[PDB]
Amino acid sequence: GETITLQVGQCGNQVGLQYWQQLATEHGIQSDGSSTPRNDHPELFFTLSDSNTYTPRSILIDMEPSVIAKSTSALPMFNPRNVHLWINGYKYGTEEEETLLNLIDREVDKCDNLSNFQLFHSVAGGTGSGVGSKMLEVISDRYGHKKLLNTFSIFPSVQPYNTILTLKRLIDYSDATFVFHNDSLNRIENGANKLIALVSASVSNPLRFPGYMYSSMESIVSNLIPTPDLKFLTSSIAPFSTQKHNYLNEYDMLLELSNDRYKTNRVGDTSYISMLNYLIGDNLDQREIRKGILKSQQRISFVPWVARSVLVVHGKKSPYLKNTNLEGIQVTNNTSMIDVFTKILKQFDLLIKRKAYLNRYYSSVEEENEVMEMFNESRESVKSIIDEYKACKEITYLDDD
Amino acid sequence: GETITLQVGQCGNQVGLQYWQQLATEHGIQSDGSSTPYPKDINDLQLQELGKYRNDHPELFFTLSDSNTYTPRSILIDMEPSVIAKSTSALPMFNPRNVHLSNNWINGYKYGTEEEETLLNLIDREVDKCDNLSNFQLFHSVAGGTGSGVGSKMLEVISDRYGHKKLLNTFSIFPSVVVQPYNTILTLKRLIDYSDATFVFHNDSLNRIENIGANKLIALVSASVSNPLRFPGYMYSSMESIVSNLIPTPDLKFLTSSIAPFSTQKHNYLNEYDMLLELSNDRYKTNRVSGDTSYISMLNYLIGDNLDQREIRKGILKSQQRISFVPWVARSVLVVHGKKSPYLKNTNLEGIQVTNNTSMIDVFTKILKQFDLLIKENEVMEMFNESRESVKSIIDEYKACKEI
Amino acid sequence: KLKISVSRLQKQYDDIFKEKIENKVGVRPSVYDVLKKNQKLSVTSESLYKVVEELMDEPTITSVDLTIPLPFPLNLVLNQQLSYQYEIMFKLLINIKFISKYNSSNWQEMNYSKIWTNSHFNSSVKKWILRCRVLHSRICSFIHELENYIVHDVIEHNFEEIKNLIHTTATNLATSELGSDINDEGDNIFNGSLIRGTFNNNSIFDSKVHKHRTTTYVEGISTVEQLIQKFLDYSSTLLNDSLLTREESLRQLRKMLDFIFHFNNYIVQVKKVLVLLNHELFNEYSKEDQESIDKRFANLSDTFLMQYEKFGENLVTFLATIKQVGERENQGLLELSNRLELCF
Amino acid sequence: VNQYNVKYSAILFNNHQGLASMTTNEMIKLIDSQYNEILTFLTQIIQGNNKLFTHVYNFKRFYFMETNDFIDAIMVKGKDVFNESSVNISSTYLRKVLQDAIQISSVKNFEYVDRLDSRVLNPQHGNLGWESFTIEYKIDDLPMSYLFEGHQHLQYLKMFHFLWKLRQLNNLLNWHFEMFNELNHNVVTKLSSRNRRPLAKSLSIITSIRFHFTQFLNELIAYLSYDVIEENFQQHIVRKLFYNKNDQDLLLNKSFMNLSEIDPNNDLPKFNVNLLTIDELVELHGTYIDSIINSSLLNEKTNISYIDQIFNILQTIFNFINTSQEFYSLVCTFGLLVQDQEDLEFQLHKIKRKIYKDIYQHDYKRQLNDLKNDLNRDYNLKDLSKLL
């Protein structure tokens, strides 16, 4: 089925520009939307006119026109009709609810069979994070739960308040949320949006370049989310490619994809809940992959109550990329989320006991009570998810004792 | 049949000039009246190695002279000569004989009454050139001065001089000053009494569409309504047949039109299926319509070469469920497969939707409220009372339309 | 099978597969263009588990088949025996694909449907839901592992050899002229060659020698007989590797697929029951007693436990069967046994 | 033909000594060359000078009702001639009607306006003009007329008859609308306020019933025109002639053989259209007509056919029109009056009751419900059932 991309905020718009440039390069679509000389299926991400032009399905949302202007000028094939221009931002989103609801309904009507909503946004984006938090609520309300949502939220490197307020709605409404940290991205680079764009583009490779299996997003996601509570994913990318000293075999890709240094978020000891590895090359040797799967299963520490299966998808490289060597992406579901969530909660508590900057949000007695109850609910939800991820680790998870 | 166009008032003349230039462009008739040779048909395939003949009906509007010169069937009525001078200069094809030259509605109405014989002679002269006349088209503004009074008097004169044996449309433009509400109600009284089908255009909603001039949109809608007549197809091809499909009773005669703006921007509609869904949007209707509206009749125009039947069928099926039909009217959506003029180089589709919904309750309510506020020889006050009662006579009727 | 109109599936398949855009006269059609319109998908009375038993209602998926008539002479190489072995694989793969599509949709509801995602359940129902979600996750992972083995470890891996061989043969023939010249001498042997009579003694040598040694597929396929034989061997490999050739493997596979399908149906019927348990949503759904609620939960306890233990039994038997068959005959099944054992 | 005779006699009798003195390979090659040349010239005539596609398009334009303006002109001009019995109509009146309708409509600029000709088929006493008039497109001046056997033309006149009835009713409803709308302004709105309200209500009821009937007829015509006639034309004529008839023999690329030579010569054109035999042309046009006449809705297959139900609804509409004329006369007699008032009011109530209850509620809604339920049993007609 078709997918709709939502871009919110300055960071979201920049990441989306890189993402769409990568996708258009992979499908050979020119900057003006004209084709270049089919077995691939860009229709899932591009709308095809009866004049042979490809335009992205994405929707651009931002508080200021400079970022949107840069993005549109860089890629002229964006449709201008889809362009629209913390608590203050969220209340502003309430005012524009009708316009945005109709704007999204236009894209849904334009496609034939909708599958999922992609969202590119930054949790630490301030006002834009507020408008994206409202976007999740309105979409989930109007379209129910038949269509799932995927959020490629960028985590932060007064900010604690914003991170908690955005994470409350991220937990409530998102169906499968990727976690990216600028710290680990710049550590890997030792710009940064080119890693997120690459990971997001590769995550959907089996859909755009069909093969024997994994033809739908339901199959890709369902392998990684045993419970709707544990919805945060850790993504790992192998950087050593296109150099002379590349990984010599896909088997070494499978073994060295699990290194903790390549993960896109700060990690000690972790337990894996689910696994799925992407291998993308013109030709793939099966016996190497079998040996690598066996070693990966014998090496990785799974939680007791999970089936303990490692899945390797055999992605196909784009014809428009000339004979490049193998590359691969790893997406995992770990219990390492407790560390980052604990860090966020510690910062939030430290800055909530001290009334440092709450004057910018508490306007009156009723506003004080409103913000206090909202903050308490967000804190309780985050603690609930931490406790759930902690109870997953132990062996008595399925016991009623 | 034949159609006679009458333009009254400055706004009416401004709209009519572009309406006639649009028609002349579609039919390949130059501004001097000279005709252009007809290009070969596109779907009339022919074997291949590897002048007066036509298949349209332009003469339904233009009088074809013995010297192969076309001339519109238009009559221009107003008092200020500047607009008429501009219109004639832009289009020399207009017949000078057809031009007639001379704020309070009463003054204009009395002027029309005193000089009714000359205008009537002009109408009869235009009719005499027509064999098997079909209908009259009126372009006038409900409020604005000359247009209101003169158009109302011409409405009455035409209605009673021919025994109402031919239907009479009305492309009225509603206003977006102390005298304006009086003029609006006074003209709407005669619109109720005499007009057979009224196309309500609201200037504020036209400005809302534009910012995404205002007369160009009116000209486009008016010149696209009659597309089946000028390019005959399987269905309709008669002005009475189109109107009769949207007017269930004489009272529910007020129609409103929706326009798809993006006929030229390179991000135009992908296909017919997309445009069928986009036409129902309330942001491009020419009359402000709320969410409590209900539709009495549906009619969609499609203008393009070799439209895909699968897309149209699927679009009709999807759009039928979305539309909220009045309980006592069967769910029916009709699509007109118009033919694009071969003279036009643009290959993009255009589509105009004409609807008969119940949103008129709010519009006439606003007009009535403004009139009531402003009210707070004696003959004129009696006419005001009569107009108030006549307007209420269809206010309550459109309200009752909701009920089985 | 009988509770649905057969003629509708044909049309709903042709809209997907054999859609067309025409081309002008003189423009050559592609071979894919020619073979698209040939194919026909029809429902047959012979179910998969019955038709495969011969060459040792149920839901319609068990009985939907696909046939492709072929032009002359292409049908001589794609002999009917080869197409029949292809059709069996089509039926098996459609069964597994359908179950995977039933495992994804049920996973969408189990996680995000309002009734399941409701927070206002009591602790007991919460733990019951958690157990059910974990069990369904195990079933999903098992099915994806089985499908991965069948499709990548059996079909693609074997097909690589044929693809390489056929490419080599195409390149070999591209440079080869059509028609070969044969020359001969005057053959003056006459009486030195007639050897008239009953016969010579050379007949014993012809029988003594053997010609069972042919390998290395040098310079690609050189005889049409080998061309047909390669594909027949490929189809036989596909059937043998898949768990359809032995009786133990086929029986275990049939039990496993039946159990998974019935579990999905039971999951669907569960959605109705959960409405009555919690109150916050029962009032909303009823718009259109403690003892009774306790009875409902007690019934669900035993039903869910039965499904859980049945899954364990089927898994144990299936692994044992694969292990014995892989150790005896098939190399491909042995590594699958190792992988599944390392899973659970 | 003479040039061809000389050319190929110079091969049979000069290059060789007859068919007997020819090896089988050369004889087959000669016959193949003759076949290609002959069919090339047959195309260059039939689809060339004769313009087969243009005349088939005109057949579809006129017989299948496409130029609705011309037929509206005929019906408005002949609204009095067709009223009398089929025996009374003479040739001169038909010619006058046809010429007036040609001048009024847009066919006067049509290229082949001369070929048009009207006729009456069966001048029976019991048949009115509407039940016998048929428009005939003369193609006798071309050799193409010998390919098109009379059976095809008879099936072209049957389908025209059905479509003619439908459009006759569609236009009668327009005249009904105009006359009642004019009467509303002339009588009802000027009547005394005491009895204006009941008459206004009755008139509104009548006009709403007319609107319902018009919607039904328009949907039926739209379905036929843009799903049966147009789809069949584009699928069986345009796609057979101009697009490639891809076949299993066209699949084989013979250029794997060296085949450096080409025959008969570069002088023989390639013609952008499939080379069809005479029997192939006859079969092509026969199948194109048969598909339309024997469509799903128009086939003869409640143990009743769809055509019978449609015709029953059409008879309902005819009865409605005939009774509405009586209502027209009674209300205009009510207008003229302003003890007779009570009698006229009673008759008005009786007529309104008859039309509202019997014709609409008792007959039309019941028949339409049965027809809608019948259509849902068919996959093809389910979509039409939802609208119609």
Author numbering:
A (entry chain Y): 3 to 39, 73 to 120, 131 to 202, 211 to 243, 262 to 338, 340 to 473
B (entry chain Z): 3 to 52, 70 to 121, 129 to 202, 209 to 244, 262 to 425, 440 to 467
C (entry chain a): 474 to 529, 573 to 804, 814 to 869
D (entry chain b): 381 to 681, 687 to 723, 736 to 785
In the authors' words:
The γ-tubulin ring complex (γ-TuRC) is a structural template for controlled nucleation of microtubules from α/β-tubulin heterodimers. The exposed γ-tubulin molecules recruit α/β-tubulin heterodimers by interacting with the α-tubulin subunits, thereby realising the function of γ-TuCs as structural templates for MT nucleation. For ascomycete yeasts, MT nucleation occurs mainly from oligomers of the compositionally much simpler γ-tubulin small complex (γ-TuSC). Whereas the CM1 motif of CDK5RAP2 binds to pre-assembled γ-TuRCs in vertebrates, the CM1-containing receptor proteins Spc110 and Spc72 promote oligomerisation of yeast γ-TuSC on the nuclear and cytoplasmic side of the SPB, respectively.
In the second branch, 14-spoked oligomers of γ-TuSCs were selected through multiple rounds of focused particle sorting and refined to resolve the full ring of seven γ-TuSC units to 8.2 Å. The atomic model for individual γ-TuSC units within higher oligomers obtained in the first processing branch could be seamlessly docked into the reconstruction of the 14-spoked γ-TuSC ring, which allowed for detailed analysis of γ-tubulin arrangement in the cytoplasmic nucleation unit. In the presence of Spc721-599, the γ-TuSC assembles into a ring with helical parameters that are indistinguishable from fungal 13 protofilament MTs. Our cryo-EM reconstruction of the C. albicans γ-TuSC oligomer in complex with Spc721-599 reveals a complex that stoichiometrically assumes a geometry fully compatible with the MT lattice. In conclusion, oligomerisation of γ-TuSC units in the presence of Spc721-599 is coupled to large scale conformational changes that stoichiometrically transition the γ-TuSC into a closed MT compatible conformation. This closed conformation is stabilised by the formation of additional inter- and intra-γ-TuSC interfaces. Notably, the conformational changes in γ-TuSC units induced by C. albicans Spc721-599 (this study) and S. cerevisiae Spc1101–220 10 are overall similar. However, while the closed γ-TuSC conformation is stoichiometrically achieved in C. albicans upon Spc721-599-induced oligomerisation, Spc1101–220-induced oligomerisation of S. cerevisiae γ-TuSCs appears to stabilise an intermediate state, in which the closed state is sampled only in a minority fraction. While Mzt1 is encoded in C. albicans, our cryo-EM reconstruction suggests that it is dispensable for the formation of stable γ-TuSC rings with MT-compatible geometry.
